[PDB]
């Protein structure tokens, strides 16, 4: 079993695709394994760059193909390097950029708790042929959190484990176990933009929506709630066009539904106040003065949604 020491150097985690549950990762892979001793020019370790690496493999150099399990398609591999030592150790260094996938929950947006995962595994050689000895990640990202979209919390979580495939029958009997490196980087979304530019103005719309009961005439009370309805429609459109596309409702999306409900409940109460009478224009002095009845009731219903 060939012992391979891996080292991942994370440079940038960007471009989060909410619908595809994808994120772009730029970095470097450093794989090291000790092979048969070589006769390098002089005695110092020989360096093999990009094109020449392929030429050495053709001659007989064993360079194992290590695949990213969670990568979407094939990653953009930059500069390649092979450092061949006279004692036998071979070091493979290459820059990479790939789109990685992971199960991502954006239900409690914009207060997300997401972890960026990286999964490495040899494509052809099993645990008895190729084994991952040790792995260390270097996230050289520090300071200027208020400028970046995401706030990296942990240093990096690593786990080397043997993955067993079910496959059913096939040609390989017992040899069905592969060593896999799992890298996890926990992060929290910056809600400073969404709180001030989306939560705060929406809150004022719903608050001003309750000020419709302070009107004197029934015609005034009803016609204003139609403008109020149009304001939430105009805001729902403003939200959905800028906010990320998702197959489920978020906290901001739920606030919009609560806004529509608040206006529709007001529409029903304004009609009920004027028509549930004993003469014709007998507006219930208590139900017309619900200026404090459901506005605090909205806070009660709003806190039920949190539970």
């Amino acid at each position: 079993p060939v012992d391979v020491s891996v080292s991942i150097f994370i440079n940038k985690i960007y471009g989060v695709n909410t619908l595809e549950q994808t994120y772009k990762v730029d970095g470097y892979i450093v794989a090291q394994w000790t092979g048969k001793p070589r006769k390098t020019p002089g005695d110092k370790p020989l360096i093999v760059e990009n094109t020449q690496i392929e030429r050495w493999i053709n001659n007989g150099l064993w360079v194992p193909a290590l695949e990213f399990i969670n990568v979407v398609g094939s990653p953009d591999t930059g500069n390649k390097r092979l450092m061949l030592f006279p004692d036998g150790r071979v070091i493979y260094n290459a820059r990479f950029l790939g789109s990685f996938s992971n199960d991502m929950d954006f239900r409690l947006f914009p207060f997300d708790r997401q972890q960026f995962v990286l999964e490495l595994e040899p494509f052809s050689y099993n645990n008895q042929q190729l084994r991952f000895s040790d792995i260390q990640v270097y996230t050289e990202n520090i300071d200027n959190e208020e400028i970046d979209e995401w706030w990296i919390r942990g240093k990096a979580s690593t786990h080397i484990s043997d993955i067993r495939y079910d496959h059913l029958s096939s040609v390989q009997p017992n040899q069905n176990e592969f060593s896999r490196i799992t890298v996890r980087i926990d992060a929290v979304r910056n809600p400073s933009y969404y709180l001030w530019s989306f939560i705060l103005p929406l809150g004022l719309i719903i608050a001003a929506s309750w000020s419709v009961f302070w009107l004197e005439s029934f015609s005034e009370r009803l016609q204003t709630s139609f403008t109020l309805m149009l304001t939430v429609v105009a805001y729902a459109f403003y939200t959905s066009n800028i906010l990320p596309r998702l197959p489920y409702t978020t906290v901001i999306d739920q606030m919009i539904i609560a806004g529509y409900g608040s206006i529709f409940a007001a529409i029903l109460l304004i009609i009920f106040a004027h028509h549930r009478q004993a003469n014709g224009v007998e507006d219930d002095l208590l139900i017309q003065r619900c200026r404090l009845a459901f506005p605090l009731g909205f806070l009660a219903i709003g806190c039920v949604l949190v539970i």
Copy 2:
């Protein structure tokens, strides 16, 4: 006839293009055929990776080109592997990512019933030269349905059949039959977002649209229906900008037309009530109180749309 055993491993089905009727599929193809016995180093099966596969074909290795019939262009092929056994059998393993096409009906959106199809067929060799012995699909997708956009129902449906091409005249007479693998994965769309953020608020708009008949003055009844008209225009824009682009009307699209119709029917009645008179301001004592006449009449028209 060379018997080839195929095995498809589905990893992710994402990125549904509604207009192009396309979907992205990430997975692995495993093709196995038994050839002439080889002399592998030692006696254990020899592994050939990526670049070296092309070198072996140049020497004389028969690797048949198996084409994806329903793929859009050329797929992104990842790591390639050739496992050559001393007994003869050859196993080809390669990761793939391609955009696949299939006839997709999105008429009853967001309650769609779609099946993701995969079609494999040899590009050059016919059924008498190359035959597909057996095929098995492994959809290792389970749990977290409420997070994913689509809900995979069935395990995977397979069908190996001989496809005969019409062509007319040409050079090949009887040899015009090819073995084809057809993989079908049935799925249902998650309507939780579209029901709460699009169906539910739209329903409230139409419900509040009928509350225009609770107004006393004709001037009030007419001017409010113009604001109501503008609300549906603002909503129709909010819908079409977020909803997928299609060459036919959906359930949500039909609801919008019903909204325009309900306001236009009101506009005609509000004019008729005030102008069809015996004195001048004689608003037909019963037609003006149609606060329950067409709102349930809309539901009756809404039940006719079920047919």
Copy 3:
């Protein structure tokens, strides 16, 4: 002159770019020419796939480069195949995906009549060196027209002609004629979405725009036309955002201009009714009742759009 028999197999015509006048075509090219007799293994025709085709050309195989005249850049060529026969005939089969250009008129949108053209011509060899013997197209597209964006009407139109280039002076004197295959597939756009979701609601906006004259007060008649103006602005935005981008006005675009004109003509007449008086509040009992004068005048302008 080498006689080459071509056969095009159309799979999918999609992705129409209105501004660039481009459309994506997926299919197969089958070129056949009779050469010098060969000694194939055994006696059965030899099959050469992808990578190996390039190896045969290096040895001395003549494979002519046939260029798509109307293609935008270079097309995505899939699997390649060379079928070499012992009698001499050579068959080249390859899957292709390319963006093709043609003069496209979208003036009478959404009732467009467009033809998808394909132009094939040898890149280096003239009509005296390479001649196209015959060409046949196979459009294996049938049923489910209501699901597809475009409705293919004609089966396929083909034309082999000799194209003469002007060039002026140069090195080649008489040899300036090349054989060209021109494939034409006529299609009609599906107007079901645009008629119900764009033509029908817009018609109701203009129809409800003429209901402004049924108002009693001049203040009511003027203030409502400002809301009417805002409704067309909101609709013009809804139209232009979803509708394809073009450097000329369509039928739907012309309808929007007619809407703006109808409201502006109303604004002028409402002012003219109130102020062309003999006291101050002398509103013309016939011009204020133009409730039928210009609404049918709009229909007369609509009939002028036909001429």
Copy 4:
């Protein structure tokens, strides 16, 4: 000094990127230079296509790399051709598609005057090594101007000049001059869409904005100007979403600012008319009837904007 005769064949100029100041050009490059006499099969000129061109260079064929100075990145090169003559002359023919850059002014949009420039220069060989003998452009574009976005005015402007680089010190002393071909194609933008769908309706908005003074009550005069303000906001959004993104204001953008100003000037005058009094509601007869004072005054300010 090698004399090279170049011939550019323009097929299509499309996809103008206003922010990047880029445009896509599809065509053919024909370069001719006389070399040492060759022994071609028979005596007729030998044709070398695509892959085989690289093989001939490896043997010792001198094919100079001619770079497009104003191209953005690397262009999409189609079919390549080398016509080797027994007398010595070598003709290089290749199809190209590239994104070209040029200093573009879109200040007086949609009535822009833009010229599409193409710059060719040898990448390695200077004017003493490689000289451009002559250049001729063939713009085979004619008729259907009303369908195309841009209207080509001139045939083609060509200029061969020696460009001297400053560089400072370096290794090359006197040898710092390179021959450069500059191709210029002048074109005027089709304003038919922008005049009818953007200039004309905007003009009606500002014209109807002045009709706010024809209202009787001060409350009516003020509340209507708020709807007028909202109409320009809705139009400014409709304009900016469809119109190209630029780092400077256009004629249409300036018209929008003039619209905001006209409404804000009206707001100030309506307040001043009512509050600058001697009793309370002493609305200045002349200042309230400014229905003709600033509407023509706007035309006077509008004429200053042109001159």
Copy 5:
């Protein structure tokens, strides 16, 4: 230690991605190092272009891989050139286009201060193997500042430094230092578009928002502020759709929040004026005439935001 002289020629800095903190840079890299003296044909320096460069490396030419540290993925390399001199010196010239990353603060938008950075470093050879002797940048960009999106201040700031990597343990002990070239081009954003098309009209919206107190009736004062609220919602949407996407609020974004606050403060004051009474309709003659109280108070709060 090999002394390498580098020269960067900047052609265009465009396409600033605010969310990814990326910018596209087009230019040329000129690397020079003195090797072992060669024997070139004749005596003049030998030129090696594109494909042939790879052929020379295979034979034994040492061409070091110089990587762009801050580049996003792999850059689009154009034409490549190797000028081999008989005295020994080797000059590598190649055109490049890459997306470069740098820490970018867009908090005080549109009055941003940014610097475009370029970082070069050898991928395999350390400071003891490869050393950067000198670096000079040529920004041939001058005049037409009012047309370009950015105004460049300096010529080009350069800094050659030895970067030491932490790595921890590994195989390399002392040899962990690499020479790095840092290029900085300081720039200031052109705010002429954003000041006239976004700051100026928004200022008029807030200024006209304070004109709601000039209304006589309480019903008029309240209903108009709802239209005012809808105007800011329509403007907030117009702003966010055109303005760049960022994870933090800008000066323009803060102005929008101030607009919502000004209307909400007015809503509370209009309700307080009418309901805080001694009879019923006792509107406080001073608090209703706050037509000058908070409008200048808004300017005071506005001046605090600047500090």
